[PDB]
């Protein structure tokens, strides 16, 4: 009888809808699709972004980010792949991972939880690779769970916490920078040629602390290049950003005459141009919603430290360009800050940055997404976003803090037989 060995190249629809929801400052998966080696991928996403109804009207916009990444299966399975592909049919099946038994767990991966509490390993591990290479601070430790059921709630139902927009206290120098370095000398002598060699060792250490925490950064400084296969990192295909706006509604009865309520609704588009898929893998699409980091109790540095010296106030170029970094506390920038929490800044940074001012009359007032109290804990706890800081800004609904409805217009050019060829023997 007739045996088919090849196919022709045709476009495939693969379009679907998007009823999404999430929290603020957490990275959640929006869409996912498998691809084959040799394909071409295209996507237009058109939708609307809404926030929960506000308590008093629109005051500050929020910014929204959409990302698309490509993750090969060889980056996840490694050597179990390759052997799988070389053996062809009759190869051993690929492994899975375990999840907690609920419906809303494994929702940060953009799927409903199966009744068996098992999902493909490449879905979970492909999310960890994106977070560890692009979204955590380079000086933080990596995250390695091996099983989605080892996470807690708010990590399984919603994504992982991300970082604030850069600021004086949300973007400090890494907590490993050295404020001094010693050189061993004799009792009544010093080698001045070895002193010259001690400055060259410190220069390489300071570069590896401010710019070059990752291997791909070290190679780039020499003038070289690394492919994402050499580093085993995902490939960023597209990125979009916008601000979300809306309007107000006026109350008209006896009690609410003079009261307003804000309604955020924004139309957006995420477009990915045609992309050649070199190996089998997955495409991820993710979203992130954030606010500018405004706090009600922040003060200017020169107004908070006690007595002004020449180094603070003069702005002398010979002094700012030759001094080590300065270590300060949370008490120097916040009214109720803790004096035992320290971080390091650059000298003269108070003449390069200006903070926002919030009047004392705004303290503890509903609506108005601010940070009411100075953040507590170690450095990593302060830099990451706490979505409980925005609970008093919205009204309680079932759809969390933001929701979206989107149509994904995907198109892939594959080499597959038609449905007719698959069901007919001859």
């Amino acid at each position: 009888s007739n045996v088919q060995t090849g196919a022709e190249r045709m476009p495939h629809d693969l379009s679907h809808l998007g009823f999404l929801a999430g929290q603020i400052g957490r990275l959640i998966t929006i869409s996912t699709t498998p691809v084959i080696a040799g394909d071409s991928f295209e996507m237009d996403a058109v939708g609307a972004l809404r926030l929960s109804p506000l308590r008093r009207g629109l005051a500050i916009d929020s910014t929204v980010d959409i990302f698309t990444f490509y993750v090969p299966h060889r980056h996840v399975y490694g050597e179990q792949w390759i052997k799988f592909m070389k053996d062809g049919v009759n190869a051993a099946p690929l492994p899975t991972v375990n999840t907690t038994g609920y419906i809303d767990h494994a929702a940060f991966l953009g799927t409903i939880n199966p009744d068996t509490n098992k999902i493909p390993k490449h879905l979970f591990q492909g999310y960890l690779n994106i977070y560890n290479n692009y979204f955590k601070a380079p000086w933080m430790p990596d995250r390695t769970e091996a099983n989605p059921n080892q996470l807690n709630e708010d990590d399984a139902r919603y994504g992982f916490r991300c970082c604030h927009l850069k600021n004086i206290w949300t973007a400090p120098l890494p907590p490993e920078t050295e404020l001094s370095r010693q050189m061993t000398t004799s009792t009544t002598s010093i080698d001045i040629m070895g002193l010259q060699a001690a400055y060259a060792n410190l220069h390489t250490d300071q570069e590896r602390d401010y710019f070059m925490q990752r291997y791909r950064d070290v190679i780039s400084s020499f003038g070289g290049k690394t492919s994402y296969d050499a580093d085993n990192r995902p490939l960023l295909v597209m990125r979009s950003n916008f601000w979300a706006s809306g309007y107000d509604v006026d109350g008209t009865d006896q009690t609410s005459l003079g009261q307003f309520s804000g309604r955020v609704q924004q139309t957006y588009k995420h477009s990915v141009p045609r992309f050649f898929v070199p190996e089998h893998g997955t495409m991820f699409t993710l979203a992130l919603v954030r606010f500018p980091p405004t706090a009600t109790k922040e003060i200017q540095y020169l107004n908070a430290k006690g007595a002004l010296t020449y180094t603070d106030i003069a702005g002398d170029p010979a002094l700012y360009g030759n001094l080590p970094p300065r270590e300060i506390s949370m008490k120097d920038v916040f009214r109720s800050g803790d004096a035992s929490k320290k971080f390091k800044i650059a000298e003269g940074q108070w003449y390069r940055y200006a903070p926002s001012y919030v009047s004392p009359a705004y303290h503890l007032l509903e609506g108005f997404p601010f940070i009411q109290e100075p953040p507590s804990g170690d450095l990593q706890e302060r830099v990451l976003i706490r979505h409980h800081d925005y609970d008093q800004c919205f009204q309680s609904v079932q759809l969390l803090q933001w929701n979206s409805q989107v149509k994904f217009n995907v198109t892939v050019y594959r080499n597959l037989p038609t449905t007719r060829d698959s069901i007919m023997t001859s």
């Binding site: 139902r157 609970d391 309680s396 609904v397 079932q398 969390l400």
Partner: protein, 175 residues
């Protein structure tokens, strides 16, 4: 005139009879029947109350499907004692790691506007309560409690509790 169409309780549509004939009030207040779901109506045509100091109650479990901290809980009751056991009624919130048969030592109380008349009591009200477990790995129970320095007597009536996690639809001829 127009019809009101706004209420405060919204009962369950299914009522259950009390499988019991007596209760003994105590500081560890006994639960009348096994708690269930987020809505329950209990009626009893005859209940014997033994002498004791403390109270007894009827409760329901809290549904945690929706991640909202504060929710509204309603009550509608009608009790008739034969004597006049001077008593006060309230709403009680407590927590337990297993199915409870009494009231633990840690709990909260809330006031609701009833209609004491001497042996008689009626109420139809709603109160906002924090419904999340407040301590990991625990269930939250909310009940209707009666407390007094009880003597031997008898009572009859019905109690209905409801947790507002969904809305009820009704026919409106003009809309």
């Amino acid at each position: 005139m127009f019809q009101t169409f706004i209420s405060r309780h919204n009962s369950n549509f299914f009522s259950d009879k009390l499988v019991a004939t007596s209760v003994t009030p105590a500081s560890l207040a006994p639960v009348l029947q096994t708690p269930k779901a987020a809505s329950s109506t209990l009626y009893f045509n005859q209940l014997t109350v033994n002498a004791g100091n403390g109270g007894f109650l009827h409760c329901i479990q809290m549904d945690t499907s929706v991640n909202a901290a504060n929710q509204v809980v309603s009550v509608g009751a009608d009790i008739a004692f034969d004597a006049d056991p001077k008593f006060f009624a309230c709403l009680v919130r407590f927590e337990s790691a297993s199915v409870p048969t009494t009231l633990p030592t840690d709990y909260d109380v809330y006031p609701l506007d009833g209609r004491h008349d001497g042996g008689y009591y009626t109420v139809k009200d709603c109160v906002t309560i924090d419904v999340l477990p407040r301590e990991p790995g625990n269930n939250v129970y909310v009940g209707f409690m009666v407390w007094s320095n009880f003597t031997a007597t008898k009572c009859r009536g019905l109690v209905s509790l409801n947790q507002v996690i969904k809305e009820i639809i009704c026919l409106q001829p003009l809309k």
